[PDB]
Design an enzyme around this catalytic site. Structure first.
Site, mmCIF file in Angstrom:
data_model
loop_
_atom_site.group_PDB
_atom_site.id
_atom_site.type_symbol
_atom_site.label_atom_id
_atom_site.label_comp_id
_atom_site.label_asym_id
_atom_site.label_seq_id
_atom_site.Cartn_x
_atom_site.Cartn_y
_atom_site.Cartn_z
ATOM 1 N N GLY A 23 0.803 -1.227 0.000
ATOM 2 C CA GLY A 23 0.000 0.000 0.000
ATOM 3 C C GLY A 23 0.831 1.269 0.000
ATOM 4 N N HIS B 30 -0.310 8.013 -0.358
ATOM 5 C CA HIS B 30 -0.689 6.631 -0.681
ATOM 6 C C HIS B 30 -2.123 6.254 -0.281
ATOM 7 C CE1 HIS B 30 3.569 6.167 -1.672
ATOM 8 N NE2 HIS B 30 3.830 6.692 -0.489
ATOM 9 N N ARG C 186 -9.370 -8.767 1.062
ATOM 10 C CA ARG C 186 -10.573 -8.205 1.651
ATOM 11 C C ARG C 186 -11.480 -7.609 0.567
ATOM 12 N NH1 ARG C 186 -6.139 -4.986 2.006
ATOM 13 N NH2 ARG C 186 -6.357 -2.795 1.360
#
Ligand SMILES: Nc1ncc(C(=O)c2cccc(Br)c2)o1
Ligand SMILES: [Cl-]
Length: 446
Positions: A165, A236, A292
Site C-alpha cells: 500500500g 498513498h 478483503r
C-alpha cells in the site's frame, strides 16, 4: 444461507455489510467499541455486543473479544470488512479454529498475499505479468545486490515483503544510494512488521493504479469484474476511484482479467479479491493482492450490477457465484469520492459533532455513510466518514452528477474534504482522464 453473522467492523462498511445481511435474511451482530454505541448500523442491528473501550487495540483489533461475541450470540460467521483484522491471517485461522466461518479466503491464502515476495512468485507462476524484479528476497551481499540492480536496470525500487500500500519502500537511481536504501527499507520493515525481508523491482516513473476485482466460489468458479483506477492519491491514500479505467479497451480488460481469474483457480482462491497493477505505457504489472472487500468496491458494483458483499456471503454459505463470466458486462461509468473529516490545510483528522447533515439524491447517486445530524465523529478511528458514488452512461455524466451531488452534500460542525473533491472534479486533467499516481500531490503542491 448463514443464520447469523458478526460484523467485525464499524462506520460505513459495517452499515454496508448490515444492508447486505438484511437483504439475505441474515441476522446481524454488531460488535462495537464504547465510543461507537450510536453508530447507525449498531442502532439497526438485531443484536449488539460492546467489545471494549474506544482504542482499536481493545475493541476492533481485540481478537478474543470478537470471537467471544460470536460465541455468546450463537453467530456462525464473522465479516471483517476492510482494515482492522481483514488481512490478519492469524485472526482468520483462530476464527476457523474456534468453529466459525471467516468471510474471506483460507488463512493460508491471506498469509500468501501478505507475503509480497511469495505472492509475486505465485502470480508470475500463474501467468500474471509482474514488474521485472529480483524474484526473491535481497540478501546482505552488496555485490549480488548491485548485480540485480544492473540486470533490472536503474532506476529501481526497494520494497518490504511484509509491507504494501505504498508503505515501506525507497527509489534507487544508482549504485551510490543502493546499500543505504536497502538498509533503511530493511530497518523500517523490521520496526513496523518484525519482518526485515526486502525485494527489488524496476522503478516505474509515472504509472497509474489499475486494480482488477475478482470473485471465486467453493465450486471452482472464478470471475473478473473489470477494473478500477485508483491513481488519485495523497500519501498513498486513495481519494478518488473510478470504474472502468479510462483508456482500457475491452481487449486489454479481457487479457488481464482472464489472467487474474486463472491465477485464482491455480491458488485455490475463495471470495472477493483485488489484484493491484501498476499500469504504464499500455502494460500491466502486478504488485500486490488484497484479499478483503475494499473501500472502493461500489464503483465496480455500479458498472456490473453485481452486489459484491452479497456474493461474499453467498460464497461463505457454500453457494456458487450468482453470475457467470459471460454474464458480466461493463455498462456505464462510476466515480467515487471519499469524504473525510479532515482539516483542509493540515490534512489531519478533524473529528467532532456533526450539527447539520444533508445527503445528495437523484438518478445515479449513491451515498455510503453512517453519519447523521447530531452524530459525533470519534477521534479514535479513520478520517473517512462517507463515500459518494455517482454513476452515468459515460464518464462525463458520472463526473457531472458527482459535481451536482457534492454541491448538495451538507456536513456542518466538522471540517471535510468536500471542497477539495469539487476541485478535483473540476480539474481539467482529471476531466481528460488517466492522471497518474503522482498527480494529486503535484497539483496540491503547485
Ligand atoms: N516498480 C514500482 N514502481 C513504482 C512502484 C510503486 O509501487 C510506487 C507507488 C507509489 C509511489 C511510488 Br514513488 C512508487 O513499484
Ligand atoms: Cl481497502
Amino acid at each position: 444461507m448463514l443464520d447469523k453473522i458478526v460484523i467485525a467492523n464499524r462506520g460505513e462498511i459495517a452499515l454496508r455489510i448490515l444492508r447486505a445481511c438484511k437483504e439475505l435474511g441474515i441476522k446481524t451482530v454488531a460488535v462495537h467499541s464504547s465510543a461507537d454505541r450510536d453508530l447507525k448500523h449498531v442502532l439497526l442491528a438485531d443484536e449488539t455486543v460492546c467489545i471494549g473501550p474506544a482504542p482499536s487495540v481493545k475493541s476492533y483489533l481485540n481478537i478474543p473479544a470478537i470471537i467471544s461475541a460470536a460465541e455468546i450470540t450463537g453467530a456462525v460467521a464473522i465479516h471483517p470488512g476492510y482494515g482492522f483484522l481483514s488481512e490478519n491471517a492469524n485472526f482468520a485461522e483462530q476464527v476457523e479454529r474456534s468453529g466459525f466461518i471467516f468471510i474471506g479466503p483460507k488463512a493460508e491464502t491471506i498469509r500468501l498475499m501478505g507475503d509480497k515476495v511469495s505472492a509475486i512468485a505465485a502470480m508470475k507462476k500463474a501467468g500474471v505479468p509482474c514488474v521485472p524484479g529480483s524474484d526473491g528476497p535481497l540478501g546482505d551481499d552488496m555485490d549480488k545486490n548491485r548485480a540485480i540492480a544492473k540486470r533490472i536496470g536503474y532506476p529501481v525500487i526497494i520494497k518490504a515483503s511484509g509491507g504494501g500500500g505504498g508503505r515501506g519502500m525507497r527509489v534507487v537511481r544508482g549504485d551510490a544510494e543502493l546499500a543505504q536504501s536497502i538498509s533503511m527499507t530493511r530497518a523500517e520493515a523490521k520496526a513496523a512488521f518484525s519482518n526485515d525481508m526486502v525485494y527489488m523491482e524496476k522503478y516505474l516513473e509515472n504509472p497509474r493504479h489499475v486494480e482488477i476485482q475478482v470473485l471465486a466460489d467453493g465450486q471452482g468458479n472464478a470471475i473478473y469484474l473489470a477494473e478500477r483506477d485508483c491513481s488519485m492519491q495523497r500519501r498513498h491514500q486513495k481519494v478518488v476511484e473510478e470504474a472502468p479505467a479510462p483508456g482500457i479497451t475491452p481487449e486489454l480488460r479481457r487479457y488481464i482479467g482472464e489472467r487474474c481469474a486463472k491465477a485464482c483457480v491455480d491458488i485455490g482462491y475463495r471470495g472477493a479479491g483485488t489484484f493491484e497493477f501498476l499500469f504504464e505505457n499500455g502494460e500491466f504489472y502486478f504488485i500486490e493482492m488484497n484479499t478483503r472487500i475494499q473501500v472502493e468496491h461500489p464503483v465496480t458494483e455500479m458498472i456490473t450490477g453485481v452486489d459484491l458483499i452479497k456474493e461474499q456471503l453467498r460464497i461463505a454459505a457454500g453457494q456458487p457465484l450468482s453470475i457467470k463470466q459471460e454474464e458480466v458486462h461493463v455498462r456505464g461509468h462510476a466515480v467515487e469520492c471519499r469524504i473525510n473529516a479532515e482539516d483542509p490545510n493540515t490534512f489531519l483528522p478533524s473529528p467532532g459533532k456533526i450539527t447539520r447533515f444533508h445527503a445528495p439524491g437523484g438518478f445515479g447517486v449513491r451515498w455510503e455513510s453512517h453519519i447523521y445530524a447530531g452524530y459525533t465523529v470519534p477521534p479514535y478511528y479513520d478520517s473517512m466518514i462517507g463515500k459518494l458514488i455517482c454513476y452515468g452512461e459515460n464518464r462525463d455524466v458520472a463526473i457531472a452528477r458527482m459535481k451536482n451531488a457534492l454541491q448538495e452534500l451538507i456536513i456542518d460542525g466538522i471540517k471535510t474534504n468536500v471542497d477539495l473533491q469539487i476541485r478535483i472534479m473540476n480539474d481539467e486533467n482529471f476531466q481528460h482522464g488517466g492522471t497518474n499516481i503522482h498527480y494529486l500531490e503535484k497539483k496540491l503542491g503547485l
